[PDB]
Enzyme design. Sequence first.
Site, mmCIF file in Angstrom:
data_model
loop_
_atom_site.group_PDB
_atom_site.id
_atom_site.type_symbol
_atom_site.label_atom_id
_atom_site.label_comp_id
_atom_site.label_asym_id
_atom_site.label_seq_id
_atom_site.Cartn_x
_atom_site.Cartn_y
_atom_site.Cartn_z
ATOM 1 N N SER A 125 18.092 4.833 24.625
ATOM 2 C CA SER A 125 18.748 3.910 24.356
ATOM 3 C C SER A 125 19.977 3.988 25.739
ATOM 4 O O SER A 125 21.091 2.596 25.183
ATOM 5 C CB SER A 125 19.448 4.965 22.385
ATOM 6 O OG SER A 125 18.798 4.480 21.898
ATOM 7 N N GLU B 270 20.023 2.166 27.989
ATOM 8 C CA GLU B 270 19.423 0.491 28.428
ATOM 9 C C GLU B 270 19.792 -0.047 27.835
ATOM 10 O O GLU B 270 19.513 -1.021 28.041
ATOM 11 C CB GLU B 270 17.857 0.990 29.672
ATOM 12 C CG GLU B 270 17.714 1.261 30.562
ATOM 13 C CD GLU B 270 17.275 3.565 30.091
ATOM 14 O OE1 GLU B 270 16.899 4.123 29.507
ATOM 15 O OE2 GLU B 270 18.796 4.033 30.500
ATOM 16 N N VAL C 274 17.154 5.589 18.156
ATOM 17 C CA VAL C 274 17.803 5.947 17.417
ATOM 18 C C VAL C 274 18.057 7.295 18.371
ATOM 19 O O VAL C 274 17.375 7.929 18.912
ATOM 20 C CB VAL C 274 16.123 6.270 16.653
ATOM 21 C CG1 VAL C 274 16.544 8.025 16.137
ATOM 22 C CG2 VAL C 274 15.968 5.923 15.457
ATOM 23 N N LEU C 275 18.602 8.446 18.297
ATOM 24 C CA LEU C 275 19.197 8.919 18.486
ATOM 25 C C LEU C 275 20.243 10.721 17.957
ATOM 26 O O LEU C 275 19.987 10.483 16.896
ATOM 27 C CB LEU C 275 20.678 9.314 19.014
ATOM 28 C CG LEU C 275 21.234 8.243 20.479
ATOM 29 C CD1 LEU C 275 22.392 7.318 21.093
ATOM 30 C CD2 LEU C 275 20.304 8.756 22.109
ATOM 31 N N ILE C 276 18.526 11.308 18.410
ATOM 32 C CA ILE C 276 18.805 12.646 17.790
ATOM 33 C C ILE C 276 19.465 14.816 18.100
ATOM 34 O O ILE C 276 19.425 14.464 19.514
ATOM 35 C CB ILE C 276 17.489 13.553 17.451
ATOM 36 C CG1 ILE C 276 16.924 11.791 16.406
ATOM 37 C CG2 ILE C 276 17.890 14.358 16.753
ATOM 38 C CD1 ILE C 276 15.620 12.497 16.218
ATOM 39 N N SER D 196 19.336 20.710 22.012
ATOM 40 C CA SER D 196 20.419 21.297 22.719
ATOM 41 C C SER D 196 21.496 21.610 23.783
ATOM 42 O O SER D 196 22.106 22.462 23.693
ATOM 43 C CB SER D 196 19.219 22.536 22.848
ATOM 44 O OG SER D 196 18.194 23.019 21.946
ATOM 45 N N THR D 197 21.909 20.688 23.793
ATOM 46 C CA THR D 197 22.720 19.896 25.214
ATOM 47 C C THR D 197 23.935 18.635 24.798
ATOM 48 O O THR D 197 23.644 19.071 23.682
ATOM 49 C CB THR D 197 21.753 19.621 26.211
ATOM 50 O OG1 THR D 197 21.285 18.267 26.306
ATOM 51 C CG2 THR D 197 20.741 20.384 26.755
ATOM 52 N N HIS E 140 23.846 16.517 25.890
ATOM 53 C CA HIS E 140 23.058 14.954 26.231
ATOM 54 C C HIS E 140 23.350 14.098 25.312
ATOM 55 O O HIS E 140 23.943 12.609 25.524
ATOM 56 C CB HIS E 140 21.838 14.989 26.308
ATOM 57 C CG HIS E 140 21.184 13.959 26.691
ATOM 58 N ND1 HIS E 140 21.197 13.404 27.637
ATOM 59 C CD2 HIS E 140 20.210 13.260 25.280
ATOM 60 C CE1 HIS E 140 20.587 12.329 27.669
ATOM 61 N NE2 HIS E 140 19.434 11.852 26.592
ATOM 62 N N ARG F 51 16.702 6.535 6.843
ATOM 63 C CA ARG F 51 17.706 5.701 6.519
ATOM 64 C C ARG F 51 16.937 4.516 7.463
ATOM 65 O O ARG F 51 17.407 3.379 7.995
ATOM 66 C CB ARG F 51 18.651 6.026 7.798
ATOM 67 C CG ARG F 51 20.152 6.612 7.395
ATOM 68 C CD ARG F 51 20.557 7.359 8.344
ATOM 69 N NE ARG F 51 21.786 8.393 7.579
ATOM 70 C CZ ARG F 51 21.573 9.529 6.338
ATOM 71 N NH1 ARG F 51 20.311 9.575 6.552
ATOM 72 N NH2 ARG F 51 22.921 10.180 5.960
#
Lengths: 147, 147, 149, 152, 147
Positions: free
Chosen positions: C52, C54, C76-78, C81-82, C84, C123
Site C-alpha cells: 500500500s 507504493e 488492505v491494511l490490517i 503488533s507494531t 506500522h 467489506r
Amino acid sequence: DLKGPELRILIVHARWNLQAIEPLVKGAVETMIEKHDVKLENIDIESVPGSYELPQGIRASIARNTYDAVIGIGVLIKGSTMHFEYISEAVVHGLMRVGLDSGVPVIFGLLTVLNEEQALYRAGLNGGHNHGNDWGSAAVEMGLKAL
Amino acid sequence: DLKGPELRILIVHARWNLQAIEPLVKGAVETMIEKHDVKLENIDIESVPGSYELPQGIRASIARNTYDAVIGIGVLIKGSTMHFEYISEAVVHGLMRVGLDSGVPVIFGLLTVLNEEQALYRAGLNGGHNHGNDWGSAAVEMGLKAL
Amino acid sequence: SDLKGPELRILIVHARWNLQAIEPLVKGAVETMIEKHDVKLENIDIESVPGSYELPQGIRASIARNTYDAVIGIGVLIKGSTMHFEYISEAVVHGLMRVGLDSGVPVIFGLLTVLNEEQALYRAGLNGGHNHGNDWGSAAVEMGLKALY
Amino acid sequence: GPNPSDLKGPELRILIVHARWNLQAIEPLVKGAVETMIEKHDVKLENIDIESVPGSYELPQGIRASIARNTYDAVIGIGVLIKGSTMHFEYISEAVVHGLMRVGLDSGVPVIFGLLTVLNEEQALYRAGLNGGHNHGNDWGSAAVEMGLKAL
Amino acid sequence: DLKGPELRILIVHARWNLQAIEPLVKGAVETMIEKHDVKLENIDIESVPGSYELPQGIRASIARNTYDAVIGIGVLIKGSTMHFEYISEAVVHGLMRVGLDSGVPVIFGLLTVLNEEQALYRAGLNGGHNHGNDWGSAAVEMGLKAL
C-alpha cells in the site's frame, strides 16, 4: 573522526525552559568544537520566543546567510490542555519542510516530554546523557555529506 | 521473476540500532542480487546518523546521482517520551514527499516498534522474517515499472 | 446508478498484500463499472504495486504516462503488533489526496484500514457483507464524468 | 515560563486576525496582545490592524487574504477551541495548526500561534488572564514584535 | 447585517446520510437567502458520492466557474474500523489545501461524529441547532471580506 573546520553551523533555540535549553546548546557547541574541530566563529547562535517560531526563525536565517547545517532546539512539556500535542505536530512538520525546501540539513533538537525531569535527564542532568552532543555530531556529519 | 540487471539502487540507512539495521541492509542487498540479478556495483549504500535525516539524506543523493529506486531504512523504538511518535510522523511524511517530488520510487524500510525484540524479529532473528528481503524486491519492481 | 461512461478510461492500482481480500474488491469494481455503467473492458487498466505504501507513487507514475479520467487506489491494511499500521495508513491517505489534487485527476480511496482479517473480508463482500469495490467503481465513473463535462 | 524582551518596534505593522467564537475569552486575549505591544514595545496604535473571521477554521484563509493585500511585519492568529462531544475539536485543531504554519512559511511572514486548544471553558479563561491565570495574549504580542524585528 | 446580493456561492455535499445532509443543505441555503439576501440562482449545489471526494469535487468546480465562497458538506460517523479516522484526516487537510491554493474561502461543513444521533442533533433535529445556518453565514461573511 569527522572534522569540519570550514563548516558554518546555525543554532536556533527557543527560550522556554532555559534550565533545559542551555545544557543542550552547550553540549551541541562543545561537541562540535572539541570533537569535530568546528571553529567557534563559525557557529551562529540565534533564538526565538517559543518552539512554534523555530521553523520561521530558521527559514529567515538561512535566507540571509549560508549554513552547512542547522540545529533547531526547543523543549515541549505536556501540560493540561492539547496545546502540547498541536505545537509538537506543527513544529515537527515545519522543520522537515524547511529542510527539504532549502536543501539545508536541519537537525531535530526538540524534546517532547511528559514532565520537566525527562527534559533535564535528556540534557545530561541527574545521570542522563546530553542529547545536544548527539545533535552536534549529526550537524557536522550532515554538513559534510551535503559537501 | 523480475530481473533488473541495469537498475541503479540507492540504500540510505540510519545508524541507530546496528544490531537490527545490518540484517535489514544485508537482506535487501542479497535479495536484489541473488534473486533479481541486480549488480553489486549498481547498489549505493549510504548512511545518516538517525532516522530523522533519512528524508534529507535521500533528497540530497538523488539530486547528485540517478537511481531507479531508493530504500530508506531505519529503526524506531517507542521510548519514555513522545519522541518516538513525532519522529515517526515526520519521517513517514518526509519520505513520501521526497518520492512524490522527485518521481523516484522510495521504499519505506522503517520499523516502528514498541521494543527491541519486535525489531529483531522483523530483521529475521529469533525465528522471524527478514523484512529487508521484501524491501529489496519492492525496490526492483518499482524501479522497473518506473521504466 | 444511471450514469454511463462508455468513453471513460479508468485506472486501478492495487497492492498485492492480502490477495484473498484484494481480488474480490477489484472484481467488484470492474464488474460494476462494466455491467452497470457501460465502461469498456479495454478502457480499464489494472496495475499493481507490492504494498500500500507504493500506491501513491504507482499512481503518480501511471497518470504521467497515460491519460485517465479517474483512478481507484486499492489496498488492505490490517492492524499488527507494531505501529506500522498507523503510520502506513497515515502516509497513504495523505499521499493519495496529494496525487489527486496535484494532477487534477479524481482518485477514489479504495483502502481498507481494519483491525483484523474478518473485517476486511466482510467489506470485500464475503461472509454476508457488502463488496465496497462496487461502490468504488461507481464513484470512479461519477467523478470521471464530472471531471470532463 | 516563557521569555519575552525589551525590544521596541515603533515602525512595525502588526496584523491580528481572531475568530468570534467565545468572545468571553477572545477579548481578554486580543486586549492583552495589543496593550503589551503598545505599552511595552512602543508599537503604534495606528499600525495595528485587527480583523476577524467567524470561526477558527477560517483563520488561515483570513490571514492569507490579508497579507496579500497589505504588508505586515508579523501576524497573530487568535482563536479558542474547546473539546466537545464529537471529534470536531480534534480535526479543526489539526487543520488550523497546519494551515497557519503553511501560510507563515509560504509568505515569509511570521505568524504567531494564538490558538487555545482546551478541554473546557475554565482552562480557556484561565489562559486569558481570568481567575488568577496569566494572559497568554501578552506573550503573543511580545512574540510578534520580536519576530517582526528579526524578519528585518 | 451582512448582505451579499451579488455573491456566487458553491455548495458541494456528499450523498452519504441524506437524512442528515438535507437539513444541513437547506439550513445553509435558507439562511443565505432569507437572512443575507443571496440570490437563489447564484447558489450552485453539487454533490459527490462520499466525503473523500469533497476536496476534488470542489477543486474541479472552482476551476470551471468563479465563486466567492464554497461550503463543503458531509457527514462522517465512526464505524467498526479505522476508516472514519483516516477519511476525516484526509478531508480536513484536503479542504484546507484547496482553499489555500485557490484563494477561495472554503467553509468546513463536515460533521465528524460518533453516532447518527449526534449528526441529526447538529442538523437541527431532536432539539438541536442546525449547523447549516452557521456555515451559510460564514460563507457570506468570508465571501464579502475576500472582496
